[PDB]
Curated annotation (Swiss-Prot):
Name of the protein in its database record: Glucuronoxylanase XynC
Enzyme class: hydrolase
Protein induction: Constitutively expressed.
Active site residues of this protein: 139, 228
Pathway(s) annotated for this protein in UniProt: Glycan degradation; xylan degradation
Activity across pH: Optimum pH is 6.
Temperature note: Optimum temperature is 65 degrees Celsius. Half the activity is retained for 25 hours at 40 degrees Celsius and for 5 hours at 50 degrees Celsius.
Family recorded in the similarity comment: Belongs to the glycosyl hydrolase 30 family.
Gene Ontology CC annotation, any one: membrane
Cross-referenced InterPro entries: Glyco_hydro_30, Glyco_hydro_b, Glycoside_hydrolase_SF
Keywords: Carbohydrate metabolism, Glycosidase, Hydrolase, Polysaccharide degradation, Secreted, Signal, Xylan degradation
Amino acid sequence: ASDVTVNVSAEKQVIRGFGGMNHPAWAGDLTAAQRETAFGNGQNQLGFSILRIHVDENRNNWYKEVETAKSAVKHGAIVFASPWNPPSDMVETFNRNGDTSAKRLKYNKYAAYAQHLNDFVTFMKNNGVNLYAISVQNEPDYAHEWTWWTPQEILRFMRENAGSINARVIAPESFQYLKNLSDPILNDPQALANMDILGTHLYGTQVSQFPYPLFKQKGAGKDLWMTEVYYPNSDTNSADRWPEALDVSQHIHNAMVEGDFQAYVWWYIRRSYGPMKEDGTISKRGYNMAHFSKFVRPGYVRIDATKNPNANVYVSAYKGDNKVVIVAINKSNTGVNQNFVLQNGSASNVSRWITSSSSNLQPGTNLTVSGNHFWAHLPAQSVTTFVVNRLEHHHHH
Ligand code: NA
């Protein structure tokens, strides 16, 4: 087998966090018990560090988001919001390639719409939630059941109106990371100045389409977030299927390593194909997310690691708070011994947690680092998170 080399000094993207969507109207709000399970980081809890909520078109419905959003903030999670439709008085039908039922924001209502979004941010502030960011539109390019925007309509709003919003602005949330939706923003200095986070979803997106050269070229000082997906499917009662659920950890691995994403946000938190089952317990898919969420905390930085050392073995690594975190996925039917070589970072002790067909985030035996490396066995069809405690602690005292 080939080594994995982890270079603690070769820094990649800063991680904002991991989480999922709450939607009281569409899915039913998380209960008090479920909010603890989602946002707390104790045993049997997901440690989600990001919550997404929706901006209702009717402001008389905004109060419904408050309790779950307050619990996220209490647990130190950041909250962001995406709208699906403007208030209906601002919306018109138009002819979209023969579809006369298609809806858009009226061109003379762009200022009114920006004011609506700013009013949501204010409402949340007045209810003890300082919203981290707000989106211009959920999936403007897949809007049969909501509000369509062309790349040029998004551009005009980003130039002229987005600067009025008193919060970080996310755009354009393509359903599939279609670059035609976001290229105009990146290519227009005015619009770009008013974007804080480039957000996308990944529905049907192939891994070859996770990289984005134009964002690397033009996006300095901007964040890159994966704001909604479910994966590999939304099959009813699929969340505990093994080894299918391992596809979730691999998808996050690809988002981190191929996409350089700084946030990974699932669709509904509680759902039969989601990270929390309808009974309020964590699903196998949920434990796959928790291998990242519980350990790679906000502000950690991804670091260079051999990403695919052997067939069916996927590895990523992160550092923060005097720790190095390594997530190693084995999607084969053979347990394998894997050597982890650490560069530019002295350590002695390694703790690990393992999810497998009959075990959920369960502690394995401690390993010892000798001569700057350690061997660890990765069981067949499993994901392991290692936590390496470093020796050189800086800052103060
Ligand atoms: Na701004």
